[PDB]
Here is the input.
Amino acid sequence: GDPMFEARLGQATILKKILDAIKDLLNEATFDCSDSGIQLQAMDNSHVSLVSLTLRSDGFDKFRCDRNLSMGMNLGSMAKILKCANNEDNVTMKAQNADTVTIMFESQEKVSDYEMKLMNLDQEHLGIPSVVRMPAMEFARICRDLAQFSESVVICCTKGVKFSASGDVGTANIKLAQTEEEAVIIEMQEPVTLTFACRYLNAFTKATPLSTQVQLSMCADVPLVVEYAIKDLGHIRYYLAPK
Amino acid sequence: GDPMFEARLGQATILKKILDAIKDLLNEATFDCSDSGIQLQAMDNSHVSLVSLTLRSDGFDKFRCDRNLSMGMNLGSMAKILKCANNEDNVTMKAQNADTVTIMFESQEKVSDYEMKLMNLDQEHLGIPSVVRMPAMEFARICRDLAQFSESVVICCTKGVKFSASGDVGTANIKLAQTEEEAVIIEMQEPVTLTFACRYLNAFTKATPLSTQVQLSMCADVPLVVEYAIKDLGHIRYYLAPK
Amino acid sequence: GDPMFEARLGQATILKKILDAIKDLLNEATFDCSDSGIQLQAMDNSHVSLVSLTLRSDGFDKFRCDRNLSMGMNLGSMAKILKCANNEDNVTMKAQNADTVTIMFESQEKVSDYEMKLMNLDQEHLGIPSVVRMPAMEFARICRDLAQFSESVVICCTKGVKFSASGDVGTANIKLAQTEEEAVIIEMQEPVTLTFACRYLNAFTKATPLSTQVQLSMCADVPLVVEYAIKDLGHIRYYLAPK
Here is the structure.
């Protein structure tokens, strides 16, 4: 007919994990689809952090976008649909204009199609705002652990990075020297020390299954950026202002 | 003395799984013991579905039943006893007449005997009421998934079977083509489509560990029968009227 | 400077498991440190059972204790610190006098130090009060299972040991004949039968990960002693009076 969006990923789990990385920060968001792929930018529910997702067209098995379109979606509903996909299902999203989007899983003997209504969301009015590379699971463990001591974590980087927290339980200091991964790589001129809200760092680490290395961009006075590479596809970035 | 019931199964886990398959639908039921084995027929707690269990005498390692007897049992208490059995324990049920039944696990160095009071339940006054064979775990997954969308699931069979649900979250369609298992086998003359209450199908799937294939008998206007083969022993069947 | 306590264990998990074994019985306790190692004796929160821990100096990779000292500690806070240790971290405890103690984990690229305030607890005023050796996991399973039937468990030992409980659910008897482990070894002159509170035995079995064999010392009229060997280091003992 005329005109359509259709994007096919080889593995549904990639999309399931992308949704896990944002669903607890955003109950709804808009996916902007264009020739170059899919992007999302939104303030979290509490309007503190900024979430920015980039998926490139060249990482899809099939990508067609006849005209630019934006799909406002309930992320909770989208998560429930992605829960229905098996381990080696692909996932196709199609939007006829739209009032709905369709999500399709295929493997073989099983074909599943799901149809979800589209919103209807306002444009966000946003501004998107140096670095240390280290294991994603180590960053996640450190943030989980230090949260036991305090709602704030001090990050102090030289060229090693130190994560600190203190409170009733006691005072904690975790020091990682510069060395699937265990490599800790640091790029710094002037040392930086900043304090961040643990509850937000811990939300960011829901992106952990997407990447074995995480990137922290931390200059003084300006938001930290936490970045997870999505293999052969793009990345998610979280922006968080220091205290 | 005179006279006794004694039935011995090689693996207690078989009985643990049988109890898992009925305990959440029936808080109490009567086991009718005779020369041909053990049977159970009962309406569920809400008096909607019918549960019918058949165990043949020739599947027990030892089966003795001097006279017919019926044992009214608290299934919750029986479940707690079976929780006490290890992986390669056998299980012997003995009833002297009934006032009690005894349940015994043996392996070796460990012998456990449990004694439970018998009821005292009324006879049920029941009437027991074409088919598609498919993986039990697939049926269970499909029913769990579709329950996210609705309290009702439409089952539409041709010769593939389609499971559908729609609601606020969206609309879902799952289509399985005719092909430990993955085989989907269909026996139909006239196509049938019926709608069932998800909460009941999901209770039936507690029988899943007993069988890798499940059987659905579905003619128009009459109750669906969901059947799990219990290896070298018998079967459990659940009966559910369509909407 | 002058003078210090410093004790280093090769594996932090040993200490994590020691804490698991006492934290639910004691919210705070005093560790008495001397030349011969570390000891702890305390009544539980309900003031029913007695917990007694012995760690020998010769089981530490490094042990220095310039003068005797006692460290009153919040066990819940100490547990939270030990949660921060990884699988092959060592653990060093240091006390300068304290007012605080420091706990340090090292592996390599990661160094963590934690600092916790010391109490300030009264001396306990205590008196420390035949035997059967058997698998720790079997003892734990038996106690968990029998708790379904009753708040009391009868232990009846000859030369096999029998564990019994009865109640609404039914009556239970578990008999272990004398034979990583499965060995059941019995040392008795006169047979003994005693009844114990299940909720306490079940608290004791939190020590299970420390030892594959457990020891029960049970003479008539006097407290049972339940003992778990801590490999190449010492033991924990729980004392419980019969009903």
User: Anything to note?
Assistant: The longest helix of chain C spans residues 12-22. Chain C has four helices and 18 strands. Residues 1-243 of chain C form a domain with the Proliferating Cell Nuclear Antigen fold (CATH 3.70.10.10).
